[PDB]
Amino acid sequence: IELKQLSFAYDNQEALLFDQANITMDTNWKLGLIGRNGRGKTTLLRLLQKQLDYQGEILHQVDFVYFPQTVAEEQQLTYYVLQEVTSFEQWKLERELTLLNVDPEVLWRPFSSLSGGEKTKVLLGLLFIEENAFPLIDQPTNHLDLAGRQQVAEYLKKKKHGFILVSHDRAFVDEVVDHILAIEKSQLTLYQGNFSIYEEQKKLRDAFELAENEKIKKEVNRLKETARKKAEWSMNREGDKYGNAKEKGSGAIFDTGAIGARAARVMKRSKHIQQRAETQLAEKEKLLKDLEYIDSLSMDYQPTHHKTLLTVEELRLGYEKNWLFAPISFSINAGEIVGITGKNGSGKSSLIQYLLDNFSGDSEGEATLAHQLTISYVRQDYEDNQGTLSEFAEKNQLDYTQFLNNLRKLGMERAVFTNRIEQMSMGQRKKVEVAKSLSQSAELYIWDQPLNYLDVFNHQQLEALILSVKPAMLVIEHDAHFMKKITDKKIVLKS
Amino acid sequence: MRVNITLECTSCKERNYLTNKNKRNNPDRLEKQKYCPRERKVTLHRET
RNA sequence: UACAUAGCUGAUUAGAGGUAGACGCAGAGAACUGAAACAUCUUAGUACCUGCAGGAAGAGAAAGAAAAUUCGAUUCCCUGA
RNA sequence: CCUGAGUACGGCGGAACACGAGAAAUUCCGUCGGAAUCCGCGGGGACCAUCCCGCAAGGCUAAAUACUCCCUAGUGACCGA
RNA sequence: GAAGAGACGGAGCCGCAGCGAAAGCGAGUCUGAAUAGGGCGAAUGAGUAUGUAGUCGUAGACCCGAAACCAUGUGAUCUA
RNA sequence: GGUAGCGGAGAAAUUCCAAACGAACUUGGAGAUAGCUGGUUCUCUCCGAAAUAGCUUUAGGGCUAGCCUCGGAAUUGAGAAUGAUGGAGGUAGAGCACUGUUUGGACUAGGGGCCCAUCUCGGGUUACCGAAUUCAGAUAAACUCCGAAUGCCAUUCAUUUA
RNA sequence: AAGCGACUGUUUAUCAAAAACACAGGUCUCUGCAAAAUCGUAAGAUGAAGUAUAGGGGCUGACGCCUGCCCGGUGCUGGAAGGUUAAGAGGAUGGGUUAGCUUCGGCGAAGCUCAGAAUUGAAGCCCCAGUAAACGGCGGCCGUAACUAUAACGGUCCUAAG
RNA sequence: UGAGUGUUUGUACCACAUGUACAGGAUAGGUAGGAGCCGAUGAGACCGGAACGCUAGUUUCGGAGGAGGCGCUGGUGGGAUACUACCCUUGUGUUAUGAACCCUCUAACCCGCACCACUAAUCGUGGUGGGAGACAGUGUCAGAUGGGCAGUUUGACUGGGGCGGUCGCCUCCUAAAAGGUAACGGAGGCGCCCAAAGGUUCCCUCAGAAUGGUUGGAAAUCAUUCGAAGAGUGUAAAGGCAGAAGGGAGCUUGACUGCGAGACCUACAAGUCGAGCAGGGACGAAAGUCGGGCUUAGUGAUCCGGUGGUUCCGCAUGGAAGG
RNA sequence: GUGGUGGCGAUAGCGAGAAGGAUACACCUGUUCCCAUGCCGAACACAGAAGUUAAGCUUCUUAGCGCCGAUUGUAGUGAAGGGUUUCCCUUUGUGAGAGUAGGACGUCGCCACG
RNA sequence: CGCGGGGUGGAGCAGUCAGGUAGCUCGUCGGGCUCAUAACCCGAAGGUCGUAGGUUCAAAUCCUGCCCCCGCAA
RNA sequence: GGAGGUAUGACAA
Ligand SMILES: Nc1ncnc2c1ncn2[C@@H]1O[C@H](COP(=O)(O)OP(=O)(O)OP(=O)(O)O)[C@@H](O)[C@H]1O
Ligand SMILES: Nc1ncnc2c1ncn2[C@@H]1O[C@H](COP(=O)(O)OP(=O)(O)OP(=O)(O)O)[C@@H](O)[C@H]1O
Ligand SMILES: [K+]
Ligand SMILES: [K+]
Ligand SMILES: [K+]
Ligand SMILES: [K+]
Ligand SMILES: [Mg+2]
Ligand SMILES: [Mg+2]
Ligand SMILES: [Mg+2]
Ligand SMILES: [Mg+2]
Ligand SMILES: [Mg+2]
Ligand SMILES: [Mg+2]
Numbered sequence A: 001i002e003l004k005q006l007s008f009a010y011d012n013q014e015a016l017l018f019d020q021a022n023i024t025m026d027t028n029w030k031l032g033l034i035g036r037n038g039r040g041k042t043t044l045l046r047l048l049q050k051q052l053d054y055q056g057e058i059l060h061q062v063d064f065v066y067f068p069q070t071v072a073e074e075q076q077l078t079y080y081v082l083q084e085v086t087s088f089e090q091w092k093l094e095r096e097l098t099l100l101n102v103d104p105e106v107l108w109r110p111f112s113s114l115s116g117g118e119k120t121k122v123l124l125g126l127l128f129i130e131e132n133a134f135p136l137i138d139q140p141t142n143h144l145d146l147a148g149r150q151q152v153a154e155y156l157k158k159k160k161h162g163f164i165l166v167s168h169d170r171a172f173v174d175e176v177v178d179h180i181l182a183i184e185k186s187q188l189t190l191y192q193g194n195f196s197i198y199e200e201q202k203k204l205r206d207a208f209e210l211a212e213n214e215k216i217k218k219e220v221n222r223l224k225e226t227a228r229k230k231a232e233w234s235m236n237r238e239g240d241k242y243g244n245a246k247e248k249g250s251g252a253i254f255d256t257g258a259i260g261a262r263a264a265r266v267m268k269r270s271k272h273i274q275q276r277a278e279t280q281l282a283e284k285e286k287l288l289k290d291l292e293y294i295d296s297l298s299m300d301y302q303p304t305h306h307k308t309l310l311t312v313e314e315l316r317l318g319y320e321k322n323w324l325f326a327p328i329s330f331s332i333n334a335g336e337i338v339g340i341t342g343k344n345g346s347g348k349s350s351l352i353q354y355l356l357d358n359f360s361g362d363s364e365g366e367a368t369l370a371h372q373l374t375i376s377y378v379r380q381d382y383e384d385n386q387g388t389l390s391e392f393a394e395k396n397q398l399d400y401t402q403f404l405n406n407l408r409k410l411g412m413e414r415a416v417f418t419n420r421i422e423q424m425s426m427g428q429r430k431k432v433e434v435a436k437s438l439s440q441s442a443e444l445y446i447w448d449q450p451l452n453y454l455d456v457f458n459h460q461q462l463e464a465l466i467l468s469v470k471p472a473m474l475v476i477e478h479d480a481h482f483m484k485k486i487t488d489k490k491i492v493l494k495s
Numbered sequence B: 001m002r003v004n005i006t007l008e009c010t011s012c013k014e015r016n017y018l019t020n021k022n023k024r025n026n027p028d029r030l031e032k033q034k035y036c037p038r039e040r041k042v043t044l045h046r047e048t
Numbered sequence C: 001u002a003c004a005u006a007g008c009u010g011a012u013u014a015g016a017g018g019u020a021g022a023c024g025c026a027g028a029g030a031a032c033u034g035a036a037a038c039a040u041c042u043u044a045g046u047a048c049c050u051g052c053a054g055g056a057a058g059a060g061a062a063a064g065a066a067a068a069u070u071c072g073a074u075u076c077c078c079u080g081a
Numbered sequence D: 001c002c003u004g005a006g007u008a009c010g011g012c013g014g015a016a017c018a019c020g021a022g023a024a025a026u027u028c029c030g031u032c033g034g035a036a037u038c039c040g041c042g043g044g045g046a047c048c049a050u051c052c053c054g055c056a057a058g059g060c061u062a063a064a065u066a067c068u069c070c071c072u073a074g075u076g077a078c079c080g081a
Numbered sequence E: 001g002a003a004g005a006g007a008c009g010g011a012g013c014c015g016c017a018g019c020g021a022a023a024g025c026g027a028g029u030c031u032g033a034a035u036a037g038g039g040c041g042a043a044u045g046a047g048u049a050u051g052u053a054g055u056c057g058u059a060g061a062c063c064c065g066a067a068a069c070c071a072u073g074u075g076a077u078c079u080a
Numbered sequence F: 001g002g003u004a005g006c007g008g009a010g011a012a013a014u015u016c017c018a019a020a021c022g023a024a025c026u027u028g029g030a031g032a033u034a035g036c037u038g039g040u041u042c043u044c045u046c047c048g049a050a051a052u053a054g055c056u057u058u059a060g061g062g063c064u065a066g067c068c069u070c071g072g073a074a075u076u077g078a079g080a081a082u083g084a085u086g087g088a089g090g091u092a093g094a095g096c097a098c099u100g101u102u103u104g105g106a107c108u109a110g111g112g113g114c115c116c117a118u119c120u121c122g123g124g125u126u127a128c129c130g131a132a133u134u135c136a137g138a139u140a141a142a143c144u145c146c147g148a149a150u151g152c153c154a155u156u157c158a159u160u161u162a
Numbered sequence G: 001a002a003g004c005g006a007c008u009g010u011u012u013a014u015c016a017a018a019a020a021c022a023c024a025g026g027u028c029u030c031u032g033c034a035a036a037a038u039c040g041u042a043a044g045a046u047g048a049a050g051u052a053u054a055g056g057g058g059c060u061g062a063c064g065c066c067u068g069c070c071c072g073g074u075g076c077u078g079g080a081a082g083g084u085u086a087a088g089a090g091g092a093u094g095g096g097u098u099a100g101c102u103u104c105g106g107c108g109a110a111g112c113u114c115a116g117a118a119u120u121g122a123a124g125c126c127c128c129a130g131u132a133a134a135c136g137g138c139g140g141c142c143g144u145a146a147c148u149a150u151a152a153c154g155g156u157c158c159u160a161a162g
Numbered sequence H: 001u002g003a004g005u006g007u008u009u010g011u012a013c014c015a016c017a018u019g020u021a022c023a024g025g026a027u028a029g030g031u032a033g034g035a036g037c038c039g040a041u042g043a044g045a046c047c048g049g050a051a052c053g054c055u056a057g058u059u060u061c062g063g064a065g066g067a068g069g070c071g072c073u074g075g076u077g078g079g080a081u082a083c084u085a086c087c088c089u090u091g092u093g094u095u096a097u098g099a100a101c102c103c104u105c106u107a108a109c110c111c112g113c114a115c116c117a118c119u120a121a122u123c124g125u126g127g128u129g130g131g132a133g134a135c136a137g138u139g140u141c142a143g144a145u146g147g148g149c150a151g152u153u154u155g156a157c158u159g160g161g162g163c164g165g166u167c168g169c170c171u172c173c174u175a176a177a178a179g180g181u182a183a184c185g186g187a188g189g190c191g192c193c194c195a196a197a198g199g200u201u202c203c204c205u206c207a208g209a210a211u212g213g214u215u216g217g218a219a220a221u222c223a224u225u226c227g228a229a230g231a232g233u234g235u236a237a238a239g240g241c242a243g244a245a246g247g248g249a250g251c252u253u254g255a256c257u258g259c260g261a262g263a264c265c266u267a268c269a270a271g272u273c274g275a276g277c278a279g280g281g282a283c284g285a286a287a288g289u290c291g292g293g294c295u296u297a298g299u300g301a302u303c304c305g306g307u308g309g310u311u312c313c314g315c316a317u318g319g320a321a322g323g
Numbered sequence I: 001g002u003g004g005u006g007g008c009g010a011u012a013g014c015g016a017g018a019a020g021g022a023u024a025c026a027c028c029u030g031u032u033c034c035c036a037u038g039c040c041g042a043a044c045a046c047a048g049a050a051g052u053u054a055a056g057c058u059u060c061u062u063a064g065c066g067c068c069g070a071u072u073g074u075a076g077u078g079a080a081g082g083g084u085u086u087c088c089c090u091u092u093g094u095g096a097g098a099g100u101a102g103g104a105c106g107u108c109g110c111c112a113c114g
Numbered sequence J: 001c002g003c004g005g006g007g008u009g010g011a012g013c014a015g016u017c018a019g020g021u022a023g024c025u026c027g028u029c030g031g032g033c034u035c036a037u038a039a040c041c042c043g044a045a046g047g048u049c050g051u052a053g054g055u056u057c058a059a060a061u062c063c064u065g066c067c068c069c070c071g072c073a074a
Numbered sequence K: 001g002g003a004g005g006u007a008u009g010a011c012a013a
């Protein structure tokens, strides 16, 4: 597999997402493919499929599979949509799902009734069923739990031939992956090693860049100073060609040509020094290209007297009296974070739906908000967002400036604000949702997997901010380390 | 941003025209009804 | 170092060296110059040096030139240009 | 049965071929690797097939060609201290 | 064949047909879808060999004149 | 006696290496190169310039055009000058009709204080400073309501020459 | 009486005798012996017919009192995990051709040939530490006292250090 | 520059084992057969250990045992077992091979190590010991370092030169009523934008002032009158435009293809305008306008490479390479 | 006489004032249809003919505004000269702008109807 | 008149390159602790970043000017 | 019971 002189930009783009890429991999490498949000990972996988108009050249002679598969008829049954996408063996899929954790009764439900967990797990079953094709695996571990990730890593270690995946999940790629493509800012890189190695070497590169820049800045300032001083000296010598009209005899000067010659030599020193400074600036201009320039975040937390913001009492919840988890009682006070956890399909989003009253199932038990409580909300199902941002921020009563501010702080370049939410990457749509939440003045925050389709930098931003402000929050995550860093009030719902 | 552009006859796949456009104001792939002298008719010329 | 070889001695055999400040084979091999600067390139495989020489040398009887089914070993002049 | 083996050829590095690596055939030097032999081998300007031409890796070979320190006989719209 | 003139020697050179990148066509050709128009050409026509003079090019090229560069060699009887 | 020039020696100065060493001397390449200075030899006759544009790692050099000379050629004699006629053109001048600058006066929005009234609300005056309008007066290379003399282009127009 | 150099010496043959050079002394650094360094294509030689109290190189320059801070940068020394890192080995695949198939299209074995991947592949670079008698470097602003001035003192920013 | 051992192992054979989804008698590898098949050639089936492992178990090793057995048929499951083979993933071994790496050997190479001889010789050549040793050295190729050394470069304009500034393009003045015209003379701009800011058809006319009116002011927006341009014309200045080039709304894409008489400017290279013809269209009823914008800046040679097309060529032929 | 439609540098116009509708042009009554008004049958478009020409539109007066515009004289200036030469003067020839006298409230046609 | 470097709460400073909505330390003010003062602790105030405009969704930051300060010149 | 060793606080009054 070879990329030769590839250049590419979507029709919307001002700039080049790729500019003369020149690389070579094969079907044997266990390859990771990493980068921030909006760099071209999914785009590049499509270009490997030849699904878009690649300028330059691409060489391959191998059949591909892209996870997630593109699906229609989200109303119809899961078995129907899966047969429509790719035929398979029902029992083989049962085996894969039961090595994972979900009952095949999900197959004979509609495809949207599932959670993202079971969606992901089932399409990964479809992946695993295929044998000959070359896996392209775009963000598999998102919407997934420890057991699923463990079994998936087991499968991928057992994997004889090669594959490609996009993760954002450091430990997960470190377990399995050998080679790494890295779509850095302004260029592209290929290493042999895991994401930890990539971290180390990129830190070294950044250190070198910054140090060399500081050297150049210091030296150029020095040389500019010296140039100015030599220049003033020359001018003072040119002043000797002439005398003073106030005092007699000062003129009648002889060999002004030699005077001017020597002054010219001094100016020529000044100019040599300036040219050196210019060359050093030219060296400077090659620097600071693969950096991120990380930034903090903000949060419009607006508390009130309500020290009790949510209560739950004996809440047993489910569909058709197949009650989905044992009854629970708990509470969310002010400045307190609560980590609601469990397996996939354990009923967490169902609990959120019972709170916000849009639960189409069976309820027994109590759940009480406060009187005039304001919610901010980050859901697991943000597909519904559509259109421009100047219209999104009108549908959702926001400040457009604070909105785009929080977006750029999350790491979206301002070339992207002209795009449409249909066009943006899933990470960028996720950033739109998070920026909505952060911009909404609210008193309780309800976060249903904010951490899926984001970057490590975004993970760090969110952790630092939530640990700095410590607002009242409900949280749902499978990144157990994050919940360890933040919360102690952890609550594991289960059947 | 403002870029010089070769259009192209969708049938002949022949370029036949040079033009200009924004990417901000004209992000979608531009199209016109222009003459293809190889066909000696008018045809949908699409940017490439 | 025993067999012997080296070594030593004696008889033999043929080389040395310079010409012709000219010609020709080989080895090694410049720069000024020209390119209006200059580095590739040019001057130039020239000058210089060295070796081998002979009256000439060198090349030389096709694992060729062509496209004609054809010319029949090299060398040199004209021409191709 | 024989018909010129560390050879032709190839890789790397360099040269000469009008041909400056260029699409670079052909020839030669260094280095390393490394064939078959008559149903065979090389060339015909990358290269493959067909056709044609030739049969390397061993040697010699006069003549036409270049030059004059010199010898003889001489010549000049060459010189005349 | 007097160091000759001259004879022989038609291989080759120029011109007589050009147009086009070329295939190729041909007083036409190329561009062009094109009998269009336009360009280059023909019907308008004269060249060639030698001599001679002016001029140009390659050769030192009009005469003198550098500092300098390179390659042999000679010099420590001066002085270190 | 030894060290020899892409070098040697140097108690080190660019110093000495056969009477001038930032790289000896000699021979050859070699008649180096010189957009640089100097020179370039007999006569007469005909005609007779330029020192300008453009481009130039170009500016004291060069190339093309311009200006000169010589030969041929043809063309409704085009060329030159003067007159008549008709045109383009906005200059000197003049003017303020626009754009700017600007003087004095009438009036004045508005801006200053002083006092009464103060919720700082409404005035009344220094002939207080004064937009803007208007009267009169000025001004201009980058102002023109106007606008020449000249010069320019052209006339199967005329005259005279070539 | 003062400056320079400690001294005796050497120095620009032919404009400079000196405060310049050397000097003993000091310090740093290299070198275990076929030394290191140097001349030279190499042999060979000096070093040395020596052997770390010897030799070479750099700086300073008798003697006396001293020789402060800085290893952030440039070098050097040592180190080493990781990434990257040439030729070479490696040979996957892809074009060109064509025996043969074809359905005209087109496909295409073997061989040959043109490009040649993955993998492997040293020093070095990125990195850690040390090193300044190694290269080199050694700050600003603001106030602050019972006359006034001034600031023992304080604050602040940067620095590798001030 | 060869003799080994060992390790990491690559490949290839050949023998070994190990295959637990869920439910399910239960640790079900796929496939077909499959209801037969095994046992004193030691059954049923117990004991200790070993491997793996999902920790449920499978198998084997050894001990006891001394006679029986496994499954069918049927239930769940996609698939039911026993047993036969075709076997397939995974990881153990034998052997042959290929590399990399460490140590060991000595027989190549080497010793400014000793002794002997040539020999009177601190050379050298040999011989015998000893040491190191397939390293070094040398050759070829490649990477890093390399002023130790070499060959070279290091603009012009310019009121001397140098700095500053400038170098290409557009507009005005200078510029002397055609055109042109210089200065290190005066002032400014450009290195783009627009998919409608183009085209066509239809329609419209601005700026400001006065008056009045609510927030609403000095001034938004509304209405009348005054209103000749005092506005606007994407972007600088000049020229011009209210018969619009300004403004608005429909339909489109002529911001077409091949061209082009003839003129302007011009040293050359270039630049500018262009009626009109042909094809095929847009708008409009039609006339008729449309080969970008309001006019003038928004740009740069050749060489060299890249992309697409081509009825061009293809070193004897067909192709291909390459043009 | 009115209406339409053209040419001539508005000497044509702008303002003010008077009268008229015979036909005519106009206003005018509406939205029934073609069609239309980023709102409105105001404008566009359509149909009609109760009413008034008040307005617009015609004809007349007005020299207030604007337009045209001499003659004279001057400035400037070509050519030829002079001087006391950043300027000034003389001869000849041409000759403005301004300021006026004055003109000017239209001229020439074609067509339909009365 | 020009060339460099500066104008960020009371002082000193970042942030300016890279627009993301003003911060570090000290100081001031208030209240606590203390017999009282300092230190310490808890609070607050003080700047649209010299200024008038543009660009932008958004300017201390980018652009254009204008006004002051320190060096040179002058 | 006893011996030797093992932070700030004006001046004067
Ligand atoms: N269809 C599209 N049209 C236009 N722009 C797009 C389109 N899809 C993606 N982009 C833009 O291209 C860039 C890369 O998007 P892409 O989907 O490749 O991201 P990614 O590498 O997968 O990142 P992420 O972590 O968000 O998944 C982003 O700026 C995104 O907005
Ligand atoms: N409409 C529905 N009808 C029936 N079952 C449903 C329906 N919606 C959801 N479920 C089931 O409810 C369970 C949990 O659903 P829920 O959306 O709450 O999951 P979750 O907690 O968000 O899970 P995950 O970790 O996968 O995101 C799953 O088994 C899912 O199949
Ligand atoms: K030179
Ligand atoms: K011979
Ligand atoms: K070749
Ligand atoms: K250091
Ligand atoms: Mg993606
Ligand atoms: Mg969920
Ligand atoms: Mg030259
Ligand atoms: Mg060959
Ligand atoms: Mg070879
Ligand atoms: Mg003589």
Ligand SMILES: [Mg+2]
Pocket: none
């Ligand atoms: Mg005589």
Ligand SMILES: [Mg+2]
Pocket: none
């Ligand atoms: Mg030299």
Ligand SMILES: [Mg+2]
Pocket: E076
């Ligand atoms: Mg001597």
Ligand SMILES: [Mg+2]
Pocket: none
């Ligand atoms: Mg000196």
Ligand SMILES: [Mg+2]
Pocket: none
């Ligand atoms: Mg020569």
Ligand SMILES: [Mg+2]
Pocket: none
């Ligand atoms: Mg004037």
Ligand SMILES: [Mg+2]
Pocket: none
């Ligand atoms: Mg003194």
Ligand SMILES: [Mg+2]
Pocket: G005
């Ligand atoms: Mg002394």
Ligand SMILES: [Mg+2]
Pocket: none
């Ligand atoms: Mg003395």
Ligand SMILES: [Mg+2]
Pocket: none
């Ligand atoms: Mg002397």
Ligand SMILES: [Mg+2]
Pocket: none
């Ligand atoms: Mg000293």
Ligand SMILES: [Mg+2]
Pocket: G034, H112
């Ligand atoms: Mg020795």
Ligand SMILES: [Mg+2]
Pocket: none
């Ligand atoms: Mg040098």
Ligand SMILES: [Mg+2]
Pocket: none
């Ligand atoms: Mg040279």
Ligand SMILES: [Mg+2]
Pocket: none
């Ligand atoms: Mg100069």
Ligand SMILES: [Mg+2]
Pocket: H158
């Ligand atoms: Mg000057």
